[PDB]
From a paper:
SOSS1 consists of three subunits: [name], SOSSC, and hSSB1, with [name] serving as a scaffold to stabilize this complex.
To clarify the molecular mechanism underlying the assembly of the [name]/[name] complex in [name] repair, we crystallized and determined the crystal structure of the INTS3c (residues 560–905, 915–995)/INTS6c (residues 800–887) complex. The structure of the INTS3c/INTS6c complex reveals an all α-helical assembly resembling the shape of a “butterfly”, with the INTS3c dimer forming the wings and one INTS6c subunit near the two-fold axis of the dimer interface making the body of the butterfly. INTS6c contains four α-helices and interacts with INTS3c via two loops between α1−α2 and α3−α4. Two INTS3c protomers form a symmetrical dimer wherein two protomers are related by a non-crystallographic two-fold axis. Analysis of the dimer interface using Protein Interfaces, Surfaces, and Assemblies webserver (PISA)22 revealed a buried surface area of ~3400.0 Å2. The core of the interface is hydrophobic in nature with Pro823 and Phe858 of INTS6c juxtaposed against Phe806 from the two subunits of INTS3c. The interaction is further augmented by salt bridges between Lys859 of INTS6c and Glu839 of INTS3c, Arg825 of INTS6c and Glu804 and Glu807 of INTS3c, and Arg857 of INTS6c and Asp769 of INTS3c.
Residue numbers in the entry:
A (entry chain B): 583 to 588, 593 to 610, 615 to 632, 634 to 638, 649 to 663, 667 to 716, 719 to 900, 919 to 972
B (entry chain C): 808 to 881
C (entry chain A): 595 to 608, 615 to 631, 634 to 639, 642 to 661, 671 to 700, 704 to 898, 919 to 972
The structure:
């Protein structure tokens, strides 16, 4: 009787009676409101007072009534999954939900866990309402760091549907201290995952990483995963950012660990920049790495021969430096004769 | 006509996101014989793969298969 | 090799326009210009049409000129030849001066546009030598850059970036790069992205192009503003940098100034405080106070005491008297 009556005001003032009567089998009620609240799951964000949100309202204001309404929400969520992000939006838009994001967790606990339903609801929101996903991302990352920070799937969802404007909005959110998408202990695995994504997705992932306060030294092992035919997006971004670094010995080692391919100019690019800006430090690092490996010897020597051939188009002195001359003389003997001949101009 | 639709489709392919609706709408206006439309779809697929947009390619290949079948019937 | 031996006889015999149309019909076949791999390029340039270029390497030029009128792709075919044959580009100068307009820059632009439409790989392989041998006709604006970034993919973008960083490619000069980026503000999103990546490859000081902050609108130019924010966050602010950051008008959704000011204040607190003190004491005063109030609101989510530094405090104390009462109350919480 109280559902076959189900203007907006009459409807919410009746939904309240529905809840009050529930407060003293709920699957069939869930099915009937599932049918009656279609055409409300359509946009969601404006450019709040609907009858379904009333339930949320009660749950924010209400012990065993709490669990009762949570089971009702669970049944409807089983019948209508979109409810999920509609809850999140509510917890961000309503003044009644001030300081009650916790509700979602308990909602996720009462469903037929938190991480699962959050991933599913964010995926549904990405499929249904990109604007709502963009506007929810900061609060979802801030309130659920242990469920989002180690998640490459959420970042994939986000970077798949955003344009340049929404990317800029996320970047400003990060730089204003309102959004954290990466942590130092998980960002490397996430970017290794990223290397499988679409082009613009990888560009967005790297632009987002650059907005954070994570040193490149944290993710520099990813160089061992970058293939020059397959990952030009990541190689581009990582090269343009490695430009600005004072190179560690580990960074030079990771750069020299890329396989030698004549069509790949990444290593010569970054080594040229570093030798032009930090000649003595780079020479020290190269000497140390040459003596430590005595990454193979011949790989290092071929990279340095490529750099030597390249440096003839600009006046410089990099190979006249004592450390690398000492290293070349120290290390010539470990090559075989074929490689002693291959690098004869370098060993001179 | 077809060159303008191609120019607009290429503009859409080189944008981030997954708003494929305009691509499909412009494709539904490709004129000429069925072989011309097959070549058009092939070029669009080539660009989409230049940007590694793989599921868009899946959909475009569904389109290509249906056009191939209707051409075989005609 | 048969028609090549015949073509040397055709060229050795000396109207040539009807002959030019005959050669167009006969050379229809080779109209990919590049091979899939040294000997590749020599076998590529061993075809008939290239023997006339080889002979040219004045009456031959009018045959070419008449050949050009009928077959326009001849232009980039010449360029490729002059890069693929040991047999540099002065022949292209002479050939462009024979056209109806005779303007080398325009003939180069038309041939590069035809090549962009007909083969992107050839355009990408020709770009370094075209910029190196014709810098003057290529560097002074971004028409050719616009052609290139309109069709390249991520692989070709990384290759061009590597060509720049290795000293084999120059696409901007410091005297023209600012206007080129300003005109690029009208390009497509990926075009602007690639243009900015190439600029970054050139290692031209950010100070050179930082005046572009007066043209960047937050709602219309998110690519340029994104790249510029990510680049500025790595610089020690230089007073003029902060001056142009503060010269952006405040709009409810524009967050660029606040983000960059927050980064700078959180890792260059004293230097940024000094810059803002000097700018306050010398873009309007209330716009600076407005950006400062936005920053003060933002800093309540953190614990940094940037506004406890005495340069900022004393500058505010000194300059409060030069605001009218409406702005004294508009910025009350800041002046306090």
């Amino acid at each position: 009787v109280l559902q076959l009556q189900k203007e907006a005001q009459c409807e919410v003032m009746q939904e309240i009676v529905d809840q009050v009567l529930e407060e003293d089998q709920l699957s069939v009620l869930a099915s009937c409101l599932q049918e009656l609240f279609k055409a409300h799951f359509r946009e969601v964000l404006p450019e709040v007072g609907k009858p379904l949100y009333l339930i949320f309202r009660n749950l924010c204001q209400m012990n065993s009534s709490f669990s009762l309404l949570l089971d009702l929400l669970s049944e409807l969520y089983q019948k209508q999954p979109k409810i999920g992000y509609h809850l999140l939006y509510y917890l961000r838009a309503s003044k009644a939900a001030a300081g009650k994001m916790n509700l979602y967790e308990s909602f996720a606990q009462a469903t037929q866990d938190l991480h699962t339903c959050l991933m599913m609801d964010m995926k549904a929101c990405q499929e249904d309402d990109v604007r709502l996903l963009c506007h929810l991302t900061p609060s979802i990352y801030t309130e659920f760091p242990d469920e989002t920070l180690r998640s490459g799937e959420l970042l994939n969802m986000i970077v798949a549907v955003i344009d340049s404007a929404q990317l800029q909005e996320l970047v400003c959110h990060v730089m204003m201290g309102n959004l954290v998408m990466f942590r130092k202990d998980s960002v490397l695995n996430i970017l290794i995952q990223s290397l499988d994504w679409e082009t613009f997705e990888q560009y967005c992932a790297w632009q987002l990483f650059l907005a954070h306060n994570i040193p490149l030294e944290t993710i520099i092992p990813i160089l061992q995963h970058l293939k020059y035919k397959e990952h030009p997006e990541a190689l581009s971004c990582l090269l343009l950012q490695l430009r600005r670094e004072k190179p560690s010995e580990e960074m030079v080692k990771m750069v020299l660990s890329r396989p030698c391919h004549p069509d790949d100019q990444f290593t010569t690019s970054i080594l040229r920049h570093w030798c032009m800006k930090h000649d003595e430090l780079l020479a020290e690092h190269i000497k140390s790495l040459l003596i430590k490996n005595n990454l193979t010897l011949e790989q290092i020597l071929e990279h340095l021969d490529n750099l030597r051939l390249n440096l003839t188009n600009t006046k410089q002195n990099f190979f006249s430096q004592t450390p690398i001359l000492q290293a070349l003389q120290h290390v010539q003997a470990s090559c075989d004769e074929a490689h002693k001949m291959k690098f004869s101009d370098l060993f001179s | 006509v077809n060159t303008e639709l191609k120019a607009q489709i290429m503009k859409e392919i080189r944008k981030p996101g997954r708003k494929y609706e305009r691509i499909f709408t412009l494709l539904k206006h490709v004129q000429g014989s069925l072989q011309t439309r097959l070549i058009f779809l092939q070029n669009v697929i080539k660009e989409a793969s230049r940007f590694k947009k793989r599921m868009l390619i899946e959909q475009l290949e569904n389109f290509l298969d249906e056009i191939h079948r209707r051409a075989n019937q005609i």
